[PDB]
């Protein structure tokens, strides 16, 4: 998108596990002064797409490479990952964390969520699992979990209603809960008036996210 | 995934606009003999990922490059894209196709759906639009449309319930309806016994998709 230019276009790259949950809320609450070009990326594409001008802003998670001096950021929200699974028809989990080699529905090895989930499982040797299904898309993992195919770590904002309906059941609310923080990243350099307006309004919007 | 190997792993690459709608139905109805590694791709990555052994199968649409002799295929289903938008609170479309420069929510220029949608708009000079929001994810376009941000062409399987609820309203059921066909692609070469079992069972499953 380096050569691509309009007066109003905002070029956003967003992590796979974050696009659907976050973009509609921003698009709906932003002033009607922008147009949007958004592409889903893996976490490690973000550095180069910002520096090469392919994206104006990155919607990602905590990134040590991006929280340094050449970039600027604002924390959009924090959330938590819960291990969940479908119910057993009686309001109880269909699977148990203690089952030897329980079916795990995981994010990809090169994803931010996957790294923290694998780090968590490693520290808890009391848990053995067999990886049944791997995908980068949060909503794909969510649906596969809802269908009863195993246990998945999913962020609270994506499963809020399903926890209320009981279609998904939380398996642990303490040691296996993983904290996550979502950030918007940009270059420290001054940008166009429309992009600077977008950044200003996104900060003012952050409280309501 | 060339070096990655297990006895049961099936490596699938699926187009962005197709992953969420199709993968859960396959995963749920397949025999419990496989594990799944699925990554979302753009349409034009499929040729090389098949030939280089990075994916066992591709879930994509009609692809002239992939329907040739070196590859084999089975049509999973056909569908249709409908231009839809949110309601106006009275059971009528919030937007009209005849509005000068109506807000369009489009797939990306390098997507299969985007090419056919743009081809359709070009042939219909009676329609002027302003592109408000571009994304590869079908479910992101769907949510942005549901929130009332403009008109989007979306496949019937993704909006079936919303058309019934009236949360989305079809704007045309004739000249602007775009036909689409979803295929599973593989190399014509003989594969492992587990992948050949997967291909056999996917054919037997196709009728129920």
Automatic annotation (TrEMBL), chains A, B:
Keyword Transcription listed: yes
Domain of life according to the entry: Bacteria
Protein's UniProt keywords contain Hydrolase: no
GO MF: DNA-binding transcription factor activity; transcription cis-regulatory region binding
Keywords: DNA-binding, Transcription, Transcription regulation
Family per similarity comment: Belongs to the LysR transcriptional regulatory family.
Record's protein name: Cell density-dependent motility repressor
Gene this chain is encoded by: yjiE_2
């Amino acid at each position: 998108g380096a050569m691509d230019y309009t007066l109003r276009k905002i070029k956003i790259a967003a992590a796979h596990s974050l696009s659907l949950g976050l973009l509609p809320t921003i698009v709906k609450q932003m002033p009607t002064q922008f147009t949007y070009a958004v592409e889903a990326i893996d976490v490690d594409q973000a550095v180069d797409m910002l520096r090469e001008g392919q994206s104006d802003f990155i919607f990602s998670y905590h990134d040590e490479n991006l929280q340094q001096a050449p970039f600027d950021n604002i924390r959009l929200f924090e959330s938590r990952l819960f291990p969940v699974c479908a119910n057993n028809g009686r309001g109880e989990p269909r699977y148990t964390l203690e089952q030897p080699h329980f079916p795990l529905l995981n994010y990809s090895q090169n994803s931010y969520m996957g790294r923290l989930i694998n780090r968590t499982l490693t520290r808890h040797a009391e848990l053995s699992f067999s990886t049944f299904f791997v995908s980068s898309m949060s909503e794909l993992l969510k649906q596969v979990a809802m269908d009863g195919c195993g246990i998945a770590w999913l962020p609270e904002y994506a499963i809020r209603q399903e926890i209320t309906d009981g279609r998904l059941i939380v398996l642990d609310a303490d040691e296996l809960v993983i904290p996550i923080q979502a950030y918007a990243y940009r270059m420290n350099t001054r940008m166009s008036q429309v992009a600077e307006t977008f950044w200003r309004d996104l900060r003012g919007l952050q409280a309501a996210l």
